[PDB]
Design a protein around this nucleic acid. Structure first.
Ligand SMILES: [Mg+2]
Ligand SMILES: [Mg+2]
Ligand SMILES: [Mg+2]
Ligand SMILES: [Mg+2]
Ligand SMILES: [Mg+2]
Ligand SMILES: [Mg+2]
Ligand SMILES: [Mg+2]
Ligand SMILES: [Mg+2]
Lengths: 337, 138
RNA sequence: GCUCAGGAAUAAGAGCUGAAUGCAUCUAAGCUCGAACUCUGACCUAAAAAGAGACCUCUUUAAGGAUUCCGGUAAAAGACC
RNA sequence: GCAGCUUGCUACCUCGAUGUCGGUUCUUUCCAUCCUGGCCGUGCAGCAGCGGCCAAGGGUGAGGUUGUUCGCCUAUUAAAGGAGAUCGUGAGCUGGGUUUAGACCGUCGUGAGACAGGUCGGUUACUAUCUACUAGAGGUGCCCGAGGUCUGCGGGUAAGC
RNA sequence: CCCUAACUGGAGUCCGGUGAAGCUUACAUUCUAGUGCACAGUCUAGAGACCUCUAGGGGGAAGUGAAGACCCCGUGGAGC
RNA sequence: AGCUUGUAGUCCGUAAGGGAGACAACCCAGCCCGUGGUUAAGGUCCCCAAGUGUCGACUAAGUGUUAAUACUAAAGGGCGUCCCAAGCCCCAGACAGCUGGAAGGUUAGCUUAGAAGCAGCUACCCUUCAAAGAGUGCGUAACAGCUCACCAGUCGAGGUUUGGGGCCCCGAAAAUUGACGGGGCUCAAGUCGACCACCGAUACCACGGAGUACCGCAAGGUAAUCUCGUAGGAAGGCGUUGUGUUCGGGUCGAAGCAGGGCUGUGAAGUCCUGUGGACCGUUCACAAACGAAAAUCCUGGUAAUAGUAGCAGCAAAGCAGG
RNA sequence: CCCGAGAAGGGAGGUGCAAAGUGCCUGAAACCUGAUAGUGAUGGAACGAUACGGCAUGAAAGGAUCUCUGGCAUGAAGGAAUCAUUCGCGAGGAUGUAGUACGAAUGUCACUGCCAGUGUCGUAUCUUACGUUUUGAAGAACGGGCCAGGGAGUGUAUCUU
């Protein structure tokens, strides 16, 4: 039979397609440290989109030296608190948590997520970790941070979000010293990312609920005379005669949306401090207006408004150091009508 | 405990399987990553690659990658693991990569039969090499 | 709007060392390179991994969980925030 | 000699029915390689060819006639490879052809009728019991009671060509 | 049709009332190869599989409806 | 051709039990019941009872680990490796190298200028010295040397040609993932030639028991030469309803029904407990509207499907107060 | 007499040897509801036969030299261990110890209160249902959802033994 070849419908690199087990994106891989100690991640909340007019400066690009319009996503980033230090041990069966020390001072609203740890061992526990590193058992150190969404207004929740980050250094002793220095303090977004650099974004995407094969995998409808015979948006065949089973690679209906996704090489265009420079007339739709400091990201970002966005320094970047963008105009038109 | 330092794989597995079935205390195989598999390099690699990529995702054969998992699977075949006797026997076997901390310094014994000194030529590979060729970090 | 590599081990093949066969020989041991393949590295999922996990905190007539109530970034019912 | 992808040979299973040809949709397998990757020879200056070896990861399309498979033709294109899955796929679709009852033309028959020749017309049944798969939940098992953050035995991928 | 998208009313999904029928030797959570009247969920050897429930399209049960309309046979019929 | 049609033997049909992965007809065995014992086929690393057995060699390919078999690849080749025999040269010295020599003549016959050993007749181009050539090739209009053949000094022990065999390699490409039964196995858990010990049937041995065949007046006697079975032939018994006849039971509880104990190889009989409230057996004989698991069987009752489909499509109709 | 809206129906209380309570004698199975015993959310299937165990029961109709545990006497076929001599390259063999110690069973003397049986579950070996058509049936050949009842070699004449 003279068959006409067609690429497979949809991608099997994301299966099974089920609801994310949490509302907070989790990072599986941390980059390699190539500089002084610092955190490798940050968190914020998505607001909406605008566009800016910036003098093009991408090297070797066609549109170099002339004005362009770019879509940007505005992200609110109130300062985070470093609440704990965690130590990991390496063996045959991979890393294993072996110690944690919490900060003495914490926010009273953290009681909504977990009961507040009490100030027991602080100096003795830290020196315990130091002795462990001194006897060459500890391999790496990670920091535990949370957000403080009570300062914002467009986000209804008042309970913090807890997650683990990574410190970037060239030695375990340096990581431990830096973690001791920064433990139990507030870290601003400027201390993590420099303006003009690239980042990686993770977030839970918008949920569409249960969807059929056509909208879930993008299969073809029924064409022509077949479009009015009873099956229009159903799949053609569920399999062959043999094997006598339906393969897992056949398109079917189920959950669509609310998965975890990652975007690569998004550029940071502006680190702001005052919210009046991005707020349109009438505020953003369904959000309100910006009150704290923010950040502008070139392009789009996964997830809807009022969703938590995690950021980490690039893991597969190609291009060399880019530079500070030259923003000329930031659109503050009404998003409404 | 039994030290798998330089022992033939099938010979070791057969002896351990029989003296598990006879009924006793449990047994421990340590250093189960430098056990010997006699045979040319290419043939061994080819057979293990074909064993690895053979199943169907929902219900096909899931051949393991880790070295102690491979040794356990090899012993699992010389044993009625579907019956009650075989399941009880499988409950008393523990193969470790390297040396676990609790079995540190423990008294060892060996199977005098399965010895690489009892081999005519130098045509063999070590189990860890096949494990790493199959893509396992141990 | 974003959508890379780099590395390890190899196939055909190209070489080094080298004897049986004083010499010569890419092969009989041994060694070095070598593909959109294979593995690793990115990415999605994963303690119901029966060897059924690690660590920390709070508290054992409590911690905490559910139902009622006002809702939606979620939603066929459940669930979730 | 190999394959069983063309046609034959046999009559072992099915006549208290295993729903035919082609196309459409969707998934997968083989290599006996059309392009993409790597090599060897040349009666290989270069460009481009000719012949062979490894390699099945990805690609292999749009149209005119015809029911067509097959095949011819057109303009592109890196190339527009061939086969298997009950000649994959009618409790998914279609009904163009073949295969009922009506009629016409030609040739046979004295005639009723026939053609292995042509032409026009001609109903597509079912509320899913079991299993498989795609997603969503409630239990019980391991476990001091509860919560949180992780690891990673394993599974998937073309995520790029 | 390329190439599908949004919307409207009736069903479906969820809740209350009413309330049938058709396949059924038995068991049954399966998958691969072989074997076997040469087309096996039950045999042989392996591989997998904690139980219950909801939704969904129909891969398989050579799914159900029915003593084949095609071919042959009967010293069976009918019409012409 | 697992095709069609013959023939001899033996089988399945109608054949258990043991072993082959499963296997109608392949190997051991033709089988009454119970207990003990030893063996056959086949096996003895684990799954799995009994050998990580012995002696002498081979294979490096996971080849093989497959009595027969409808289930197992060929011609051809191998300076792959293990053996036998036959010739030839040989420590006063064979082969591979180290070396040079291959000088006399010629520039061979050659027309193209030239195919001057290497297009095209010839012949060993030296009387002679290891060598000396009509002579391959880098070169080569022609050559030429460098030098081929062909011998010589040199080391210092085996070298070389053929034939017949064992195993293995190439030749060798198919469709869901996968078949030595599986794990695995390398001086073997493979192949070849021998050997030892043990395991393993209902077979064979012993004891007890049943039945049968034949004989005997009976008691009993013989059976290594008796114990499979479909179509089918023959013999003896059990049960249901009734008649003739003999002897009985029942309101101090008949038949029937539910569940149990004992007897018989069995059809079945009898007894016990609960229910029930009026009829039922037995000896010897004789009769029949006389024994059900199956007929897409007939009649009645009743499941699952299932609290499911339907209660929408052509006329979407109701709300407030009393 | 009490509940109930009640000429429904229920409870208590009566009639009768006995509820036999009105289509009311007895009152089976399929099917449905509850309780008891065994088992049960890591698990493989013709639903069972045989042997050994756990748990539950074992009043009647079954055992009392019977059930359990031992001693002694006779013991058929079979029949060692151990040691010593000797043969073999070796695994091992032969002879003697020895037809000895033991050995199914047959008797006998103490000891004990259970055994037989029944239900369900587990372990070991074996078996792919039943009737039929077939050379061949577990069949992807046909028949049956289940239970009760009904349901198939009979008479006259004549011939033969
Ligand atoms: Mg179909
Ligand atoms: Mg006839
Ligand atoms: Mg016979
Ligand atoms: Mg048999
Ligand atoms: Mg008969
Ligand atoms: Mg009946
Ligand atoms: Mg017959
Ligand atoms: Mg009857």
């Amino acid at each position: 039979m003279a068959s006409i070849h067609r690429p497979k419908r949809g991608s099997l690199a994301f299966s099974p397609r089920k609801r994310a087990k949490s509302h907070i994106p989790r990072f599986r891989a941390w980059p390699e440290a190539t500089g002084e100690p610092k955190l490798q991640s940050f968190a914020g909340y998505k607001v909406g989109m605008t566009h800016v007019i910036m003098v093009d400066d991408t090297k070797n690009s066609l549109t170099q030296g002339m004005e362009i319009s770019v879509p940007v996503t505005v992200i609110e980033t109130p300062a985070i608190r470093v609440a704990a230090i965690r130590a990991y041990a390496e063996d045959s069966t991979g890393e294993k948590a072996i110690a944690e020390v919490w900060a003495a001072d914490l926010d009273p609203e953290l009681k909504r997520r977990i009961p507040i740890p009490a100030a027991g061992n602080q100096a003795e526990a830290l020196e315990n970790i130091g002795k462990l590193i001194e006897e060459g058992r500890v391999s790496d150190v990670r920091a535990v941070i949370y957000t403080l969404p009570k300062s914002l207004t467009g986000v209804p929740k008042k309970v913090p979000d807890i997650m683990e980050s990574g410190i970037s250094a060239r030695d375990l002793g340096t990581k431990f010293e830096y973690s001791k220095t920064i433990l139990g303090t507030l870290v601003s977004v400027t201390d993590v990312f420099k303006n003009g650099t690239l980042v990686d974004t993770a977030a839970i995407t918008i949920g569409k609920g249960t969807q059929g094969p056509v909208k879930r995998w993008g299969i073809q409808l029924m064409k022509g005379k077949h479009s009015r015979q009873g099956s229009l948006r159903q799949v053609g065949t569920l399999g062959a005669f043999n094997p006598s089973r339906v393969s897992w690679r056949v398109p079917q209906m189920g959950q669509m949306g609310y998965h975890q996704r990652t975007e690569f090489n998004k550029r940071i265009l502006k680190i702001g401090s005052d919210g009046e420079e991005v707020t349109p007339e009438g505020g953003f739709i369904n959000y309100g207006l910006v009150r704290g400091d923010y950040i502008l990201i070139k392009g789009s970002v996964p997830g809807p408004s009022k969703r938590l966005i995690r950021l980490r320094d690039p893991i597969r970047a190609k291009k060399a150091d880019l530079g500070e963008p030259n923003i000329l105009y930031i659109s503050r038109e009404s998003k409404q009508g | 405990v039994i030290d798998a330092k330089g022992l033939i794989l099938g010979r070791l597995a057969s002896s351990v399987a029989k003296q598990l079935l006879s009924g006793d205390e449990k047994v421990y195989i340590i250093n189960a990553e430098q056990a010997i598999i006699s045979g040319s390099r290419a043939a061994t690699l080819r057979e293990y690659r074909e064993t690895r990529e053979r199943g169907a995702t929902e219900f096909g054969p899931y051949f393991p990658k880790r070295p102690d998992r491979i040794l356990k699977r090899t012993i699992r075949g010389m044993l009625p693991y579907k019956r009650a006797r075989g399941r009880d026997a499988m409950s008393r076997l523990k193969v470790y990569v390297g040396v676990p901390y609790e079995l540190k310094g423990a008294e060892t014994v060996t199977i005098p039969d399965a010895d690489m000194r009892l081999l005519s030529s130098s045509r063999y590979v070590e189990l860890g090499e096949v494990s790493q060729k199959m893509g396992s970090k141990f």
